[PDB]
């Protein structure tokens, strides 16, 4: 890749600079280069990878929704709205495929600790979910099942190996609940998962330091925010 000649440590340093500069495409390219060095990622490095791509795909998702809404209104002016929505959609799919490619080659298979493996399987579920948001053809069901499968494996590991307040476990459950609500069209499963996750975390907060308490309650509030909208 175009980052092949740069040192791993320099790529990490520049990813952190890119984050400070709000240059998220650069940040993602630097972290992709770091992954392609072939070494496992530390906790901080995994978070840099995720933050970078989350910001890139987030811009694409927001743009796609704007264009999709305009397109739907135009169907209630020529091919241009569809063409441009398709252009953004294809770039979004490309980013998701890139992330999934990094996870499959070879981040997941080398991830043995729960904190790394759950993190990567959650990401796999997330990027299949972003693909599902735009999917319409004969593969939509298979994309949805790929998201479900990744989230389910992550859930199974997280429940065996992490406390119920673990922020990775909490963010996984949050995202899987949203998958249920609006991708799988299982709102009851979404509500049940969010409630059970919130309540089991509540009951474990007493074990935490002040700093860990803050980390866990931040994500618990996101579960509550969704439950308030859903019930």
């Amino acid at each position: 890749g175009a980052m092949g000649s740069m040192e791993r440590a320099s790529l990490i340093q520049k990813a952190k600079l890119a984050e400070q500069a709000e240059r998220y495409e650069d940040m993602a390219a630097f972290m992709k280069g770091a992954v392609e060095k072939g070494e496992e990622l530390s906790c901080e490095e995994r978070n840099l990878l995720s933050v970078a791509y989350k910001n890139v795909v987030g811009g694409q998702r927001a743009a796609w929704r704007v264009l999709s809404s305009i397109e739907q209104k135009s169907n209630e002016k020529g091919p241009e709205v569809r063409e441009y929505r398709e252009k953004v959609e294809t770039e979004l799919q490309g980013v998701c495929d890139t992330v999934l490619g990094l996870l499959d080659s070879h981040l997941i298979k080398e991830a043995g600790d729960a904190e790394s493996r759950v993190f990567y399987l959650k990401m796999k579920g997330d990027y299949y979910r972003y693909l599902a948001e735009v999917a319409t053809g004969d593969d939509k069901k298979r994309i949805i099942d790929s998201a479900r499968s990744a989230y389910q494996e992550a859930m199974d590991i997280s429940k065996k190996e992490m406390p119920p307040t673990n922020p990775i476990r909490l963010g996984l459950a949050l995202n899987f609940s949203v998958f249920h609500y609006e991708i799988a069209n299982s709102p009851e499963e979404a509500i049940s998962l969010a409630k059970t996750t919130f309540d089991e975390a509540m009951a474990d907060l007493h074990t935490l330091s002040e700093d860990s308490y803050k980390d866990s309650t931040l994500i618990m509030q996101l579960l509550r925010d969704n439950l308030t909208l859903w019930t």
């Binding site: 809404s69 996984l172 949050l174 949203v178």
Partner: peptide, 12 residues
């Protein structure tokens, strides 16, 4: 579209 809360940067 109404977007629900998911983990990490709310970048969309």
């Amino acid at each position: 579209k109404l977007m629900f809360k998911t983990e990490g940067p709310d970048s969309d």
